[PDB]
From Swiss-Prot:
Gene Ontology cellular component annotations, sorted alphabetically: mitochondrion
Record text about domains: The GGQ domain interacts with the peptidyltransferase center (PTC) of the large ribosomal subunit to trigger nascent chain hydrolysis.
Residue positions where N5-methylglutamine is found in the record: Q61
PTM annotation, UniProt: Methylation of glutamine in the GGQ triplet by HEMK1.
Gene behind the chain: Mtrfr
GO MF entries: ribosomal large subunit binding; translation release factor activity, codon specific; tRNA binding
Protein name stated in the entry: Mitochondrial translation release factor in rescue
Annotated keywords: Coiled coil, Methylation, Mitochondrion, Protein biosynthesis, Transit peptide
Motif residue range(s): GGQ: 59-61
Region span, GGQ domain: 45-109
UniProt source species: Mus musculus
Amino acid sequence: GSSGSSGKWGLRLQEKPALLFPGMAASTVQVAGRKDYPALLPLNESELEEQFVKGHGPGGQATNKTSNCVVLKHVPSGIVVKCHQTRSVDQNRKIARKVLQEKVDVFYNSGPSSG
């Protein structure tokens, strides 16, 4: 075997610390809080397609009969509705339009329903 040594002497220096300065304290935007800003959306009546019931085809049970049942649906939303309030087609149209408007509103303000 063998051995050895190394008397590595040395010196050092230092001084007192100095002062510092403060930093900025900015701010930023927050969440919306709410999430249902829109409601009862404008349903353009000139953008809809209606249908009229004259009877029903062979379907066994039920098989609807001739009535002033006006049918209305939303094109982009595909939601359909069948209302019958009076014997007047144009009165039933209005009533069908308002009920469809309520349904399309939530379909735009929210998502689908199980699908």
